[PDB]
C-alpha cells in the first residue's frame, strides 16, 4: 500500500526530468495517482493526476503543456515527465493516492475522496 518515489535531482533550466512513483496495486484499485508539489516555504500545490482505468490525465494550469503524466500498467508505476522547467518548479514533489476504494457496510466499495497515502517526497531543484 506504500508509495515509493524516485528519479528526482538537480536539473538545468529548459531541461527535462522524469519522476517515478511505484504504488501497490494502482491499476486495479481504481484510484488516481496525483503529483502534488510544495515549493520551499510555501504551501501545497497540485500538479497532475492520472486515472488507473483509462489513463486519463489532468494537469494544473501552471504545468499544462510542459508536464506529462503517464502510467506503466505492466510495472504498475506512474511517471511524471517534466519539460522546460523554470525557477518556480523547484519544489518537493509528493506522489499521492486519491480515490481509493474501501469496503464499507453492506459489501459496498466506496471511493475515498482524499489523499490517504503520500510518498515521502523528492526534491527537484532548477538552477
Amino acid at each position: 500500500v506504500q508509495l515509493v518515489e524516485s528519479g528526482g535531482g538537480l536539473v538545468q533550466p529548459g531541461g527535462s526530468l522524469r519522476l517515478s512513483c511505484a504504488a501497490s496495486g494502482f491499476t486495479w484499485s481504481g484510484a488516481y495517482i496525483h503529483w502534488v508539489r510544495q515549493a520551499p516555504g510555501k504551501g501545497l500545490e497540485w500538479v497532475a493526476s492520472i486515472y488507473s482505468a483509462g489513463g486519463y490525465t489532468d494537469y494544473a494550469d501552471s504545468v499544462k503543456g510542459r508536464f506529462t503524466i503517464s502510467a506503466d500498467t505492466s510495472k504498475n508505476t506512474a511517471y511524471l515527465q517534466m519539460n522546460s522547467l523554470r525557477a518556480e518548479d523547484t519544489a518537493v514533489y509528493y506522489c499521492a493516492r486519491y480515490g481509493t476504494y474501501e469496503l464499507k457496510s453492506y459489501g459496498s466499495w466506496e471511493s475515498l475522496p482524499a489523499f490517504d497515502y503520500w510518498g515521502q517526497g523528492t526534491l527537484v531543484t532548477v538552477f
Binding site: 501545497l44 509528493y94 475515498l112 475522496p113 482524499a114 489523499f115 490517504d116 503520500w118 510518498g119 515521502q120 517526497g121
Partner: peptide, 26 residues
C-alpha cells in the same frame, strides 16, 4: 460536502489525512 478534506503536515514530512469528507474521521 464530500469534496473538502483536511490534512495535517508536520515540517519536513509528507501530509497525512484527517477529515476526508468535510465531517468524516479518517
Amino acid at each position: 460536502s464530500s469534496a473538502v478534506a483536511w490534512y495535517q503536515q508536520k515540517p519536513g514530512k509528507a501530509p497525512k489525512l484527517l477529515i476526508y469528507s468535510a465531517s468524516s474521521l479518517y
